[PDB]
Ligand binder design. Structure first.
Ligand SMILES: CC(C)(COP(=O)(O)OP(=O)(O)OC[C@H]1O[C@@H](n2cnc3c(N)ncnc32)[C@H](O)[C@@H]1OP(=O)(O)O)[C@@H](O)C(=O)NCCC(=O)NCCS
Length: 358
């Protein structure tokens, strides 16, 4: 019992995807402490209209003003589960809504979306059903762990430059000014919690959001949010083509799911400076590959994701927070399933299970 991932199997009409609604939010602070409020939310603040063009030094402060998170801490769903626990009696959708939902991180859904096109990076998703609700929690594969531990210095600095770009583009207050003189602390995060539905699969998920744009067309979340990215400056049509085919797919999937309608890219030169900014509206990203023989197709992404959710729901029959069905996938193969109990794979903590049980 496995699930094939070839795009041709999923090339039908675009499935139903509910306009996402923000149910709430939470923040993680510089010490990675949870707070049930928007204190981590920053505000889109691009270069002044009359000033010079961007020249953001993304290397500035690396590494002496860099406070990296501890990647050996496995948080799994814990922060989202705290939000759910604290809001379980205030969820919309009527009685039993949560029991019919699938609960996960936005990025887990992103990896499902891009699976039909992914050629390098496999994944593992642990699944447990508990009080009807299906929970999906990513497991770091042994190969991803090894590449994390052997991360080249170049790639470590590139992760910093991404975070640093937000420091140049966002302010602590609406209409305020950025202040890049501080530290880059990757514990800090603002997370939007969303309701959606894909096909007949209700979803509750959360995703980190870079900033709110007081100038957005719509002021209500998630339509007012902006996702920030960096990418190498491109100079040839072939370079742009490769960017549309590979990078844009991931940018699209990540922001389509939570309803974030704009991705703003800082293009960086080889010396590490952002010299150019470009806005990519999420619902226009596919236009760049719509007539491309080697392009991606959002219908394939969403139809595979729906097929996986159906596959996971029908595979995880037993309601048991200590039981895990592990869905494993590597490029060139189907999604396969193995069954595990308790540690290490079981991921729903007793502080969640016990409260929900009572
Ligand atoms: C809080 C969190 C869980 C929210 O999840 P999410 O929104 O679903 O995560 P996404 O994968 O979509 O990533 C969104 C952002 O989180 C941040 N982030 C994600 N993984 C990160 C890491 N390993 N280190 C630092 N920051 C990270 C980045 O700012 C990223 O933005 P980008 O896509 O522009 O790079 C996520 O930010 C996070 O911390 N993920 C780390 C998970 C992890 O390390 N798992 C272990 C391997 S399985």
């Amino acid at each position: 019992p496995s699930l094939r991932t070839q795009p041709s199997l999923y090339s039908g009409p675009f499935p139903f995807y509910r306009r996402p609604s923000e149910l709430g939010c939470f923040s993680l602070d510089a010490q990675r402490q949870y707070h049930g409020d928007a204190r981590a939310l920053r505000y889109y603040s691009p270069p002044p209209i009359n000033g010079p063009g961007p020249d953001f030094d993304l290397r500035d402060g690396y590494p002496d003003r860099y406070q990296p998170r501890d990647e050996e801490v496995q948080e799994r769903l814990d922060h989202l589960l705290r939000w759910v626990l604290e809001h379980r009696n205030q969820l919309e959708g009527g009685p039993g809504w949560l029991a019919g939902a699938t609960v996960t991180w936005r990025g887990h859904l992103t990896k499902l979306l891009t699976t039909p096109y992914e050629r390098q990076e496999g994944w593992q998703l642990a699944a447990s059903r508990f009080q009807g609700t299906l929970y999906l929690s990513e497991v770091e594969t042994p190969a991803a762990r090894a590449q994390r531990l052997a991360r080249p210095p170049l790639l470590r600095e590139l992760m910093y430059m991404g975070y640093k770009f937000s420091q140049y583009m966002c302010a602590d207050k609406p209409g305020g000014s950025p202040d890049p003189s501080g530290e880059v602390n990757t514990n800090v995060a603002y997370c939007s919690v969303l309701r959606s539905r894909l096909g007949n699969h209700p979803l509750l998920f959360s995703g980190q959001v870079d900033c709110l744009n007081p100038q957005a067309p719509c002021t209500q979340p998630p339509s007012c949010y902006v996702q920030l990215k960096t990418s190498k400056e491109m100079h040839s049509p072939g370079q742009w083509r490769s960017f549309y085919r590979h990078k844009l797919l991931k940018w699209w999937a990540q922001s389509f799911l939570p309803g974030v309608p704009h991705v703003v890219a800082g293009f960086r030169n080889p010396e590490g400076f952002v010299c150019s900014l470009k806005t990519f509206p999420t619902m226009e990203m596919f236009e760049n590959v719509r007539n491309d023989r080697e392009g991606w197709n959002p219908s394939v992404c969403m139809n595979f994701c729906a097929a996986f959710l159906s596959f996971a729901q029908s595979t995880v029959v037993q309601d048991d927070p200590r039981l895990v069905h592990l869905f494993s996938w590597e490029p060139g193969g189907p999604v396969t399933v193995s069954v595990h109990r308790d540690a290490p794979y079981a991921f729903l903590p007793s502080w969640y299970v016990e409260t929900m049980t009572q």
